[PDB]
Amino acid sequence: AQSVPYGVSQIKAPALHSQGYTGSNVKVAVIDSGIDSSHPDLKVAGGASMVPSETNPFQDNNSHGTHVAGTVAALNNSIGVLGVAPSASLYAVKVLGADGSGQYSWIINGIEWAIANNMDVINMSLGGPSGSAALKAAVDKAVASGVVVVAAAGNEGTSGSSSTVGYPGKYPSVIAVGAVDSSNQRASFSSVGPELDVMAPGVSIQSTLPGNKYGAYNGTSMASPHVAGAAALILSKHPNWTNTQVRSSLENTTTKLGDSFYYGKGLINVQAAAQ
Numbered sequence: 001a002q003s004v005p006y007g008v009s010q011i012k013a014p015a016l017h018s019q020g021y022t023g024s025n026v027k028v029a030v031i032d033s034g035i036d037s038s039h040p041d042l043k044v045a046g047g048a049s050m051v052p053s054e055t056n057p058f059q060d061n062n063s064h065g066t067h068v069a070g071t072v073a074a075l076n077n078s079i080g081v082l083g084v085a086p087s088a089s090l091y092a093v094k095v096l097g098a099d100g101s102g103q104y105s106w107i108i109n110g111i112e113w114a115i116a117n118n119m120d121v122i123n124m125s126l127g128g129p130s131g132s133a134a135l136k137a138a139v140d141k142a143v144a145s146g147v148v149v150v151a152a153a154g155n156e157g158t159s160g161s162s163s164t165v166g167y168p169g170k171y172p173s174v175i176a177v178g179a180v181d182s183s184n185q186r187a188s189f190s191s192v193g194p195e196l197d198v199m200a201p202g203v204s205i206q207s208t209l210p211g212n213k214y215g216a217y218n219g220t221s222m223a224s225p226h227v228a229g230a231a232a233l234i235l236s237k238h239p240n241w242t243n244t245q246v247r248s249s250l251e252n253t254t255t256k257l258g259d260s261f262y263y264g265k266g267l268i269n270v271q272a273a274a275q
């Protein structure tokens, strides 16, 4: 029947579920490669596509977006997996093509969309090594608007003492998420630097795949959603908190693990974070 992936347990999401907080009424935008609307373990509330050659956002041609969405909110039923915030309202915002890539403008368009539609949380399990002025402006706009923005830190490992976090995670207004294994040890591909903020499970993350399938992937793209999902549970318990409050609470309630250059503030603990 249904399994609870370990990563979900590892951030203490189940504890909130038993208090009765499952992400209800919270709008999460997954800014990725779309969400397969034919997967029974997902409930999509809305969406829009910014890729010109692939106008249906409910059609994930890459499978990256569907896996990410499953971590956030795979439904609580008799099958497949379970997500961090299983009652969250999930929006498919397509900005990456079949090949996994996307144009900055598509990405910006997708942020603008999320803003305009009053998304509560945005997940960006994507990144590049270069930022742009307009990317930064849109991300700043989201946070200025009241949205919690989460982004993968990247899968660039270490490079001596240089920062390896990619854009948009490198920006201050964004929560950059690195990955740990089940042992709380950083995964070797996990990006590092001053901008890394928090850690979440990123190794063998079992989630939803297109075509009514399930599978495991590793990477900071798999870690990010854990945090976006955590932000969702907090907002279900404290609808009146601002993103300011949510971000603060997640960063001040972590489990510390090692030099912040490598672990940022540590592993999130949404049970603690949620108050």
Ligand SMILES: [Ca+2]
Binding pocket: 002, 041, 074, 075, 076, 077, 078, 079, 080, 081, 082
């Ligand atoms: Ca399920």
Ligand SMILES: [Ca+2]
Binding pocket: 169, 170, 171, 172, 173, 174, 175, 176, 195, 196, 197
């Ligand atoms: Ca950051």
